[PDB]
């Protein structure tokens, strides 16, 4: 049982929580990490900074930790500026195709893929005031990255393997302040999940679903006090008033990835203490 | 110990059984509620070892008890003659919803997993348009209201962080000609009620409740549904009652503490398809 | 001439009236069905000119007739004593669904627009969780099944390319604490039944059927709903009964020949909002 | 009552049918037209070729017919190659900002906007096999064009104005063969419709909805016998067995655009003889 988690920059995200729970079930974990934060993540790991967090009387497995940039499909896609940037030029094989081939050489076929990354340069702006170039950015890094991720991993994956991504309810209902086309990319990503589920199903016997998670105070969540407010609101209005942990998403992700969800494919599962069901406060 | 009540089962060919088999994998003690009129039969078949092979998991399914259970009656007060003097019913006792909740609580104490796995419409083979008021409401009473009732009476005998599920079918959201009698209307209400109950039980008892929208099984209309499904579903595999059961097991556990009020499709992905090919 | 039957109206403060006003704009002749127990009152108020100003469109609303109408009874056969000897009912006649369809057909011939605008649950102020079986089913019978019944008996007296609508509320899809008694379950089923009826009536009689999911009006719970709505809805304007009526008029016309089985939200866009701001 | 229809290349589309019905109600119509087909559309108009089709005992109004390219927001966005292409270099003011300013000079404020255009270079490929550049193409011309269209027209539009676009059910359910990210763009567009509806509502008292239309044998529909099959299927399985005309979409569009739908905003209305409601054939 091998899982590649694409998109973990630290310990405060959904990627980490997913990692943790996949370990409880003894699956081997390969982190794919964005180069802007790669050196410093590695450093912290070495300094045993994440050592508290790797606690489960269990200890986390971490098979490998690779540089990974979901905006590049192949090496030909890497622009020269990036190729030479201070933070990339010492690193290698970080395109989507490249990490796919890496992994396969080092470990062969794997059977679990977590897409856990999103990005938009104009997330701060709202839809109307987002540029074409900013919108297409959001969709390229949040939505298309999934598709591409699939294209390349699908054949280093065994039959009956399963894939998941992460989404947010703002695709289905309006959350003012979730901007830059981020809603649009979650909308796109939830649709692609259905279409990919059809293709990967018939053709590769491979499942794909997506988890619509609640608010977590991740690094990326602070890409705009919205989130503190979102957590506040969720903890007062959701059917379940417990605090939403990333491990909560993690245990569901783990389930989706296991053979136990063998007959669930193409779905948007909500893991959010049921907030999505409410129309009216009280 | 962990105890699950499965309300609505008459053989091994259904969901309740698949759900029971899978729960047994986590060593959950199982109590079956059986519709009184087939209860003794079921009890007989059990004795004659008829369910022996279906019961093997290599470990034996631990069936804590098997009780008469009629989802159409809330309390004893509702047992309305004739019924009281009906050939089958009169030899049995304590089969109303509230009565069953008392027995279970008395013999075993509190439980922590509830499964509503029962559907019945007396006119299930006619168009909604040709369904009678009496028929429709029987559908809603047995297949929809029963869920609320079961919750009302069982919440008192459940630990906090308990979990509930029912079974639903996609006919509620999209047209399936053939699923008549108001079974569609029933599931529509069941799914909506699952949301509403999720809010109340969640806030008031920290109890979760979800519904599994399952694909066709077996346990006429079903024979088409299955062929169509295995033809067009994203996933080519045969859908098993344990496929629903393993999902149920998960939903009924703490691993899904943050999921509630949801409709989970376990149908090989049939629901995502628009037109064939 | 074009004739619309509006089943479910007791004053000018509701949807049936707003719908009636707007239909009158297209010179549609209107027949009102009134719940028998308030029928004579309504008839009195009509006589005393109480509805005179509400009736002006500058042209006068043409009310073809006003008949007692009880959505809880399908045929005469169902009028079950007491009811037959109830203070209000016994002085009236032909108010069952089938009976009304016969009168209309007899006096005016075929119609071509039907409006189901009636909702009633006897326990509308309690939680779903505290709602009784009797209460729930009354809800489903009056607010949901009535729709099917009305279709069953009226299709015979309708021209082809006829059109039908009912009114629904978003509580069916998402939790609105306060909308209890199974009104939510009712609307859930009404919306699902609208799809199913759309298939049958569409294929079998080329008749269309849709439902309007309206925002709060007036006609307690509503007072909050309205303030919240006018605060948070995408559209700041006050929502009028004629806002629903103008949409209804459209849906009931040939201009919408290619729309059927749909739930149309007329609620200033409230439904698209997740969290406030 | 002025309406700008963005995206009509001939008489066989939804744009034309919408035009026709808006005329029945005496509203003035400005066609925005893609330059690759502009000269030839004009020619046909002049040769009175469309004269049969402009029949309603009514005759169509056509206030103006402008060149229009929804892939350009402003003149600065026009690449030099395009700027010089055989088919563009004789034409002017065809960016989104430009046609917005044109129209306003010539006629002032308008109050009706029809988005009726879509495009994807790799529509023939299916999701998995679509490139980043092809996906982003679909989203840029089918989804973002709407947003941009709004940004620029919103303030040459009076309060209480209304906007509509066109979508297809493949966003919500899987239609194999509707590829190139076209499903993804309909998914995105239906989401943006909700978010735009919130912003335009509160801020400009302006409504936006989208129509999910059935199959019509438009020029663009043949961008892949899929459609003949789609029309075949729809006419045998839809609740309504009538043939679906573009004027059917047109009369609904007209309604959405009128004050009659004054309280409907942010919605996806299905105009498809109810096919979307079916799960199972028979
Ligand atoms: N935090 C929330 O409230 C919330 C809610 C719902 C959904 N989500 C989703 O969860 C997922 C994970 O986000 P998170 O909230 O855990 O924050 P996060 O910052 O931990 O996760 C995003 C990570 O992806 C990496 N990344 C960004 N762009 C990349 C690229 N081009 N390629 C590779 N790596 C890249 C970043 O380094 C970052 O660490 C996202 O898809 C997000 O949309 C988050
Ligand atoms: N035909 C169908 O079965 C169907 C079904 C559902 C939805 N739709 C939608 O209806 C809308 C109209 O398409 P149609 O089916 O009438 O075909 P159509 O070809 O008549 O409409 C598309 C028109 O937009 C123009 N166009 C394309 N790219 C453009 C750009 N960059 N800027 C400006 N103009 C451009 C083209 O010249 C074309 O004539 C589309 O949004 C489509 O997605 C069509
Ligand atoms: N540059 C941007 C960026 C924007 C959003 C992101 O993901 C999310 C980050 C936060 C939330 C969120 C926000 C509020 C409440 C609940 N969840 C949802 C998300 O999808 C990420 Cl990971 C990055
Ligand atoms: N290059 C491409 C391109 C692709 C799809 C398009 O629009 C549609 C064209 C056809 C259908 C369609 C296809 C089959 C059945 C019903 N509708 C749906 C659409 O959204 C258009 Cl206008 C252009």
């Amino acid at each position: 049982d091998i899982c590649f988690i694409a998109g973990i920059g630290d310990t405060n995200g959904y990627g980490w929580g997913i990692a943790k729970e996949l370990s409880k079930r003894n699956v081997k974990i390969i982190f794919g990490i964005w180069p802007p934060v790669y050196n410093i993540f590695m450093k912290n790991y070495k300094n045993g900074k994440f050592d508290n967090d790797m606690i489960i009387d269990k200890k986390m497995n971490i098979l490998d930790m690779l540089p990974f940039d979901a905006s590049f499909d192949t090496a030909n896609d890497i622009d020269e500026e990036t190729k030479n940037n201070k933070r990339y030029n010492m690193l290698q094989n970080y395109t989507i195709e490249d990490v796919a081939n890496l992994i396969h050489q080092k470990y062969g076929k794997i059977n679990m893929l977590v897409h856990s990354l999103a990005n938009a340069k104009e997330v701060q702006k709202d839809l109307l005031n987002t540029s074409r170039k900013g919108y297409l950015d959001a969709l390229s890094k949040s939505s298309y990255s999934l598709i591409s991720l699939c294209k390349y991993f699908v054949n280093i994956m065994k039959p009956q393997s399963s894939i998941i991504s992460l989404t947010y309810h703002a695709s289905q209902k309006v959350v003012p302040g979730y901007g830059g086309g981020m809603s649009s990319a979650k909308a796109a990503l939830e649709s692609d999940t259905r279409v990919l589920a059809y293709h990967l199903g018939r053709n590769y016997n491979i499942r794909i679903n997506t988890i619509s998670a609640g608010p977590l105070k991740s690094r990326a969540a602070t890409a705009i006090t919205f989130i503190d407010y979102a957590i506040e609101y969720s903890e007062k209005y959701a059917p379940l008033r417990q605090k939403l942990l990333s491990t909560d998403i993690g245990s569901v992700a783990s389930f989706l990835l296991s053979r136990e969800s063998r007959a669930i494919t193409g779905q948007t599962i909500y893991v959010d203490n049921g907030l999505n069901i409410m129309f009216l406060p009280d």
Side-chain angles (χ1 to χ4, degrees), chain A:
Chain A
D1 273 331
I2 303 264
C3 182
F4 181 53
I5 301 174
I8 169 188
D10 56 44
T11 29
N12 314 293
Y14 280 122
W16 181 263
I18 295 160
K20 206 130 61 190
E21 298 291 322
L22 287 180
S23 293
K24 279 194 178 65
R25 169 159 75 96
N26 299 306
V27 335
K28 277 70 200 171
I29 319 227
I30 309 175
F31 292 156
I33 314 167
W34 206 32
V37 310
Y38 171 68
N39 274 2
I40 107 184
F41 185 88
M42 292 298 293
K43 167 173 66 166
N44 282 347
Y45 175 81
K46 167 87 177 190
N47 301 342
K49 304 289 169 66
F50 304 144
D51 278 354
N52 268 358
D53 307 8
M54 303 208 285
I55 287 178
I56 296 177
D57 286 344
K58 318 183 191 61
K59 188 64 167 181
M60 269 196 48
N61 160 286
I62 300 189
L63 219 189
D64 220 347
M65 312 191 31
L66 310 184
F68 170 69
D69 197 341
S71 34
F72 301 132
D73 307 313
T74 68
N76 197 242
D77 299 304
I78 310 157
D79 55 77
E80 204 170 22
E81 188 185 339
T82 288
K83 198 173 323 223
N84 301 321
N85 185 77
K86 153 88 166 49
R87 208 140 273 297
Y88 281 80
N89 53 349
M90 89 228 312
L91 314 169
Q92 300 190 16
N93 310 293
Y94 51 87
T95 60
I96 289 165
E97 178 178 56
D98 287 344
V99 294
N101 280 322
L102 218 176
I103 292 175
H104 185 21
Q105 293 167 346
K106 308 199 178 308
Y107 317 95
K109 282 175 189 280
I110 69 173
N111 47 50
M112 281 178 184
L113 181 57
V114 170
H115 180 276
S116 188
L117 67 94
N119 223 333
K121 268 156 178 166
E122 313 185 19
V123 48
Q124 289 174 298
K125 295 166 165 197
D126 56 26
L127 253 208
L128 257 186
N129 296 97
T130 293
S131 89
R132 187 177 296 258
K133 214 166 298 180
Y135 186 89
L136 297 170
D137 183 74
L139 275 130
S140 174
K141 320 216 166 140
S142 303
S143 313
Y144 184 76
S145 44
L146 179 60
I147 297 166
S148 195
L149 204 72
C150 285
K151 187 56 182 167
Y152 290 103
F153 274 73
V154 81
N155 58 160
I156 82 154
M157 291 179 98
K158 286 154 279 185
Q160 305 191 312
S161 300
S162 136
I163 296 147
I164 59 152
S165 74
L166 272 64
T167 178
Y168 182 60
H169 189 53
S171 43
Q172 308 308 322
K173 298 302 187 197
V174 179
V175 175
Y178 189 78
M182 203 49 42
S183 60
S184 323
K186 292 316 184 184
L189 174 145
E190 289 177 35
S191 212
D192 303 346
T193 293
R194 278 187 292 279
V195 179
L196 294 179
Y198 170 73
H199 284 310
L200 299 189
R202 316 305 284 277
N203 295 175
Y204 301 71
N205 198 36
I206 282 178
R207 306 178 296 115
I208 177 161
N209 293 283
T210 190
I211 284 169
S212 192
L216 192 80
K217 199 165 188 189
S218 53
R219 186 191 198 272
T222 321
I224 13 194
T225 325
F226 179 70
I227 194 58
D228 303 278
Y229 154 71
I231 294 161
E232 225 150 39
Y233 190 101
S234 173
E235 291 175 5
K236 298 201 181 187
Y237 293 126
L240 277 9
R241 275 143 82 70
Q242 75 199 233
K243 203 181 190 34
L244 182 71
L245 312 176
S246 89
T247 52
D248 289 348
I249 277 60
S251 60
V252 180
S254 188
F255 166 68
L256 286 170
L257 288 171
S258 88
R259 284 289 285 159
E260 304 285 298
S261 45
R262 144 178 207 258
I264 297 171
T265 199
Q267 309 296 285
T268 304
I269 314 298
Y270 284 76
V271 187
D272 67 346
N273 295 325
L275 215 217
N276 67 106
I277 76 185
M278 301 308 301
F279 181 31
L280 285 191
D282 224 1

